Amino acid sequence: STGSATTTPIDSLDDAYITPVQIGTPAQTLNLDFDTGSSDLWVFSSETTASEVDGQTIYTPSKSTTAKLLSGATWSISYGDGSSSSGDVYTDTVSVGGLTVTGQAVESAKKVSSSFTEDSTIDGLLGLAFSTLNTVSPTQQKTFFDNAKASLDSPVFTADLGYHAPGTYNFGFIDTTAYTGSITYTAVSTKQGFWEWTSTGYAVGSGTFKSTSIDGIADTGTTLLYLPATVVSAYWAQVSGAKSSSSVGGYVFPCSATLPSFTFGVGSARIVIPGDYIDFGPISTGSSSCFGGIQSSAGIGINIFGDVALKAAFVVFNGATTPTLGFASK
């Protein structure tokens, strides 16, 4: 089997991407944030504290003939941005782009933090990291991908995120029309439960490539590119007037600037992020200070190849017995 679903930016900045997901019988379609940096499929639901729901579409398990309470199971998750959610668990039928999993754990939120409430466009998350990070207790649950894997034509999924445009998540096949050149594969460590890999270096604009190992995670659920302070300083030094602002929370730059590209290495291959992808617009409405899309990972504890980086590539998440990651230009 295979599946193919379109993923759409939630706003004009590509702050996140939503993908429609069918849950239950009859289908209830919710727009979920596919997150390769976490491993819980959780939704706004009929159980979510009413004051914490503001515009989201909810899953109502009592209206699904295939829903079953997973008795005694609870979940609770905290994300890198300080947001969180928790609740109980049902199993139900879940379909993405025509690919169906029966008995998928669907984690129903009883509580969500303010950032989730405030984002009316995101009805939940669908985790695509390794199932070892799943938070369900006392019986850990598998991700949608892990459940689907054995049925897929090939044990892979691909992320093809758009810049200010829709893109595609495919399951079970590699669309050879969706990228240019060849796919370069690179080793993955699953020791921390992430799609963790080592970039071979970087360049700023038309500058020379610096060969240096940068360990980080491929994370579709993180908006920006978070890299070591040395790398980030080298980038922003090429933008007149750019500075790190503790009050704003990162690097800012004059909105009048033209940003240089940023290149990262995948083995001997190179992925180029155009300068425009690094512009996250005014820090506040009407400001002439703009927020940068490349930020320091110092004090996160991990480097993160988030959407800024991933949307410049066609990315293969290879879930074979020894997982790997593939990157191609597009």
PDB file of N, CA and C in Angstrom, residues 67-113:
ATOM      1  N   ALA A  67     -14.229   3.464  17.248  1.00  0.00           N
ATOM      2  CA  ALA A  67     -13.455   3.940  18.394  1.00  0.00           C
ATOM      3  C   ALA A  67     -13.606   3.006  19.585  1.00  0.00           C
ATOM      4  N   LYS A  68     -12.508   2.764  20.283  1.00  0.00           N
ATOM      5  CA  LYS A  68     -12.544   2.009  21.524  1.00  0.00           C
ATOM      6  C   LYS A  68     -11.621   2.666  22.537  1.00  0.00           C
ATOM      7  N   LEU A  69     -12.109   2.892  23.749  1.00  0.00           N
ATOM      8  CA  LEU A  69     -11.256   3.419  24.805  1.00  0.00           C
ATOM      9  C   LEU A  69     -10.116   2.436  25.055  1.00  0.00           C
ATOM     10  N   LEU A  70      -8.893   2.941  25.120  1.00  0.00           N
ATOM     11  CA  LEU A  70      -7.758   2.139  25.529  1.00  0.00           C
ATOM     12  C   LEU A  70      -7.693   2.278  27.048  1.00  0.00           C
ATOM     13  N   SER A  71      -8.306   1.316  27.730  1.00  0.00           N
ATOM     14  CA  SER A  71      -8.602   1.465  29.135  1.00  0.00           C
ATOM     15  C   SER A  71      -7.353   1.643  29.982  1.00  0.00           C
ATOM     16  N   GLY A  72      -7.359   2.695  30.795  1.00  0.00           N
ATOM     17  CA  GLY A  72      -6.274   2.975  31.710  1.00  0.00           C
ATOM     18  C   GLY A  72      -5.120   3.768  31.136  1.00  0.00           C
ATOM     19  N   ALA A  73      -5.116   3.989  29.828  1.00  0.00           N
ATOM     20  CA  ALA A  73      -3.989   4.647  29.177  1.00  0.00           C
ATOM     21  C   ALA A  73      -4.111   6.159  29.261  1.00  0.00           C
ATOM     22  N   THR A  74      -3.005   6.813  29.588  1.00  0.00           N
ATOM     23  CA  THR A  74      -2.964   8.267  29.598  1.00  0.00           C
ATOM     24  C   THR A  74      -1.700   8.719  28.877  1.00  0.00           C
ATOM     25  N   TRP A  75      -1.635  10.007  28.559  1.00  0.00           N
ATOM     26  CA  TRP A  75      -0.480  10.544  27.854  1.00  0.00           C
ATOM     27  C   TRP A  75      -0.276  11.977  28.308  1.00  0.00           C
ATOM     28  N   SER A  76       0.952  12.448  28.169  1.00  0.00           N
ATOM     29  CA  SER A  76       1.311  13.798  28.566  1.00  0.00           C
ATOM     30  C   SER A  76       2.618  14.135  27.876  1.00  0.00           C
ATOM     31  N   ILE A  77       2.639  15.256  27.160  1.00  0.00           N
ATOM     32  CA  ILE A  77       3.797  15.601  26.356  1.00  0.00           C
ATOM     33  C   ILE A  77       4.139  17.069  26.529  1.00  0.00           C
ATOM     34  N   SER A  78       5.435  17.358  26.488  1.00  0.00           N
ATOM     35  CA  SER A  78       5.941  18.721  26.504  1.00  0.00           C
ATOM     36  C   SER A  78       6.876  18.865  25.316  1.00  0.00           C
ATOM     37  N   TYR A  79       6.737  19.956  24.581  1.00  0.00           N
ATOM     38  CA  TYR A  79       7.537  20.169  23.385  1.00  0.00           C
ATOM     39  C   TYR A  79       8.650  21.182  23.640  1.00  0.00           C
ATOM     40  N   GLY A  80       9.581  21.269  22.698  1.00  0.00           N
ATOM     41  CA  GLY A  80      10.748  22.118  22.849  1.00  0.00           C
ATOM     42  C   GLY A  80      10.443  23.597  22.969  1.00  0.00           C
ATOM     43  N   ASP A  81       9.275  24.006  22.485  1.00  0.00           N
ATOM     44  CA  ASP A  81       8.867  25.402  22.568  1.00  0.00           C
ATOM     45  C   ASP A  81       8.104  25.711  23.856  1.00  0.00           C
ATOM     46  N   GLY A  82       8.032  24.738  24.760  1.00  0.00           N
ATOM     47  CA  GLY A  82       7.392  24.940  26.045  1.00  0.00           C
ATOM     48  C   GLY A  82       5.908  24.636  26.061  1.00  0.00           C
ATOM     49  N   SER A  83       5.352  24.289  24.905  1.00  0.00           N
ATOM     50  CA  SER A  83       3.943  23.924  24.833  1.00  0.00           C
ATOM     51  C   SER A  83       3.735  22.498  25.329  1.00  0.00           C
ATOM     52  N   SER A  84       2.485  22.146  25.608  1.00  0.00           N
ATOM     53  CA  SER A  84       2.184  20.842  26.188  1.00  0.00           C
ATOM     54  C   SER A  84       0.723  20.466  26.002  1.00  0.00           C
ATOM     55  N   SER A  85       0.440  19.181  26.177  1.00  0.00           N
ATOM     56  CA  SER A  85      -0.918  18.672  26.131  1.00  0.00           C
ATOM     57  C   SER A  85      -0.946  17.317  26.823  1.00  0.00           C
ATOM     58  N   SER A  86      -2.141  16.867  27.200  1.00  0.00           N
ATOM     59  CA  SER A  86      -2.287  15.587  27.887  1.00  0.00           C
ATOM     60  C   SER A  86      -3.720  15.099  27.810  1.00  0.00           C
ATOM     61  N   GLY A  87      -3.929  13.815  28.068  1.00  0.00           N
ATOM     62  CA  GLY A  87      -5.273  13.281  28.077  1.00  0.00           C
ATOM     63  C   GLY A  87      -5.313  11.775  28.161  1.00  0.00           C
ATOM     64  N   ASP A  88      -6.336  11.187  27.543  1.00  0.00           N
ATOM     65  CA  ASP A  88      -6.511   9.731  27.538  1.00  0.00           C
ATOM     66  C   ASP A  88      -6.445   9.230  26.090  1.00  0.00           C
ATOM     67  N   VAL A  89      -6.746   7.954  25.853  1.00  0.00           N
ATOM     68  CA  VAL A  89      -6.403   7.330  24.582  1.00  0.00           C
ATOM     69  C   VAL A  89      -7.528   6.441  24.082  1.00  0.00           C
ATOM     70  N   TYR A  90      -7.799   6.527  22.781  1.00  0.00           N
ATOM     71  CA  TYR A  90      -8.696   5.624  22.072  1.00  0.00           C
ATOM     72  C   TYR A  90      -7.883   4.923  21.005  1.00  0.00           C
ATOM     73  N   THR A  91      -8.350   3.769  20.561  1.00  0.00           N
ATOM     74  CA  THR A  91      -7.876   3.248  19.287  1.00  0.00           C
ATOM     75  C   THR A  91      -8.971   3.456  18.265  1.00  0.00           C
ATOM     76  N   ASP A  92      -8.570   3.730  17.032  1.00  0.00           N
ATOM     77  CA  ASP A  92      -9.543   3.944  15.967  1.00  0.00           C
ATOM     78  C   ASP A  92      -8.833   3.782  14.626  1.00  0.00           C
ATOM     79  N   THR A  93      -9.618   3.804  13.560  1.00  0.00           N
ATOM     80  CA  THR A  93      -9.093   3.747  12.203  1.00  0.00           C
ATOM     81  C   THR A  93      -8.637   5.130  11.772  1.00  0.00           C
ATOM     82  N   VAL A  94      -7.410   5.210  11.263  1.00  0.00           N
ATOM     83  CA  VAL A  94      -6.811   6.474  10.838  1.00  0.00           C
ATOM     84  C   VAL A  94      -6.311   6.310   9.420  1.00  0.00           C
ATOM     85  N   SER A  95      -6.681   7.245   8.550  1.00  0.00           N
ATOM     86  CA  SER A  95      -6.226   7.213   7.167  1.00  0.00           C
ATOM     87  C   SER A  95      -5.566   8.532   6.789  1.00  0.00           C
ATOM     88  N   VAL A  96      -4.456   8.422   6.070  1.00  0.00           N
ATOM     89  CA  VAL A  96      -3.711   9.565   5.550  1.00  0.00           C
ATOM     90  C   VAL A  96      -3.534   9.356   4.065  1.00  0.00           C
ATOM     91  N   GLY A  97      -4.119  10.238   3.271  1.00  0.00           N
ATOM     92  CA  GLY A  97      -3.883  10.201   1.845  1.00  0.00           C
ATOM     93  C   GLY A  97      -4.191   8.848   1.221  1.00  0.00           C
ATOM     94  N   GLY A  98      -5.224   8.164   1.718  1.00  0.00           N
ATOM     95  CA  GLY A  98      -5.599   6.865   1.187  1.00  0.00           C
ATOM     96  C   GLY A  98      -4.982   5.645   1.849  1.00  0.00           C
ATOM     97  N   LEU A  99      -4.044   5.858   2.764  1.00  0.00           N
ATOM     98  CA  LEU A  99      -3.400   4.782   3.507  1.00  0.00           C
ATOM     99  C   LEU A  99      -4.095   4.642   4.851  1.00  0.00           C
ATOM    100  N   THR A 100      -4.572   3.439   5.151  1.00  0.00           N
ATOM    101  CA  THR A 100      -5.383   3.205   6.344  1.00  0.00           C
ATOM    102  C   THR A 100      -4.673   2.299   7.344  1.00  0.00           C
ATOM    103  N   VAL A 101      -4.681   2.724   8.607  1.00  0.00           N
ATOM    104  CA  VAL A 101      -4.239   1.913   9.734  1.00  0.00           C
ATOM    105  C   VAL A 101      -5.430   1.668  10.640  1.00  0.00           C
ATOM    106  N   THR A 102      -5.694   0.410  10.959  1.00  0.00           N
ATOM    107  CA  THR A 102      -6.700   0.114  11.968  1.00  0.00           C
ATOM    108  C   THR A 102      -6.016  -0.051  13.327  1.00  0.00           C
ATOM    109  N   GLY A 103      -6.728   0.280  14.393  1.00  0.00           N
ATOM    110  CA  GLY A 103      -6.196   0.125  15.732  1.00  0.00           C
ATOM    111  C   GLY A 103      -5.117   1.138  16.085  1.00  0.00           C
ATOM    112  N   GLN A 104      -5.081   2.277  15.399  1.00  0.00           N
ATOM    113  CA  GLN A 104      -4.129   3.327  15.725  1.00  0.00           C
ATOM    114  C   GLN A 104      -4.486   3.981  17.054  1.00  0.00           C
ATOM    115  N   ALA A 105      -3.487   4.206  17.902  1.00  0.00           N
ATOM    116  CA  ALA A 105      -3.703   4.992  19.111  1.00  0.00           C
ATOM    117  C   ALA A 105      -3.918   6.456  18.755  1.00  0.00           C
ATOM    118  N   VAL A 106      -5.092   6.954  19.121  1.00  0.00           N
ATOM    119  CA  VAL A 106      -5.493   8.336  18.927  1.00  0.00           C
ATOM    120  C   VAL A 106      -5.611   8.935  20.318  1.00  0.00           C
ATOM    121  N   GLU A 107      -4.690   9.834  20.630  1.00  0.00           N
ATOM    122  CA  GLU A 107      -4.573  10.398  21.961  1.00  0.00           C
ATOM    123  C   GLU A 107      -5.462  11.632  22.045  1.00  0.00           C
ATOM    124  N   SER A 108      -6.485  11.542  22.881  1.00  0.00           N
ATOM    125  CA  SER A 108      -7.499  12.570  23.005  1.00  0.00           C
ATOM    126  C   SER A 108      -7.088  13.562  24.074  1.00  0.00           C
ATOM    127  N   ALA A 109      -6.984  14.835  23.705  1.00  0.00           N
ATOM    128  CA  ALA A 109      -6.546  15.844  24.658  1.00  0.00           C
ATOM    129  C   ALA A 109      -7.658  16.202  25.631  1.00  0.00           C
ATOM    130  N   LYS A 110      -7.330  16.160  26.913  1.00  0.00           N
ATOM    131  CA  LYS A 110      -8.177  16.769  27.933  1.00  0.00           C
ATOM    132  C   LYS A 110      -7.721  18.194  28.226  1.00  0.00           C
ATOM    133  N   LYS A 111      -6.415  18.433  28.092  1.00  0.00           N
ATOM    134  CA  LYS A 111      -5.820  19.735  28.349  1.00  0.00           C
ATOM    135  C   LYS A 111      -4.815  20.033  27.258  1.00  0.00           C
ATOM    136  N   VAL A 112      -4.767  21.294  26.846  1.00  0.00           N
ATOM    137  CA  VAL A 112      -3.727  21.770  25.938  1.00  0.00           C
ATOM    138  C   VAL A 112      -3.243  23.121  26.450  1.00  0.00           C
ATOM    139  N   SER A 113      -1.986  23.447  26.175  1.00  0.00           N
ATOM    140  CA  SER A 113      -1.449  24.733  26.595  1.00  0.00           C
ATOM    141  C   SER A 113      -1.888  25.849  25.653  1.00  0.00           C
TER     142      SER A 113
END
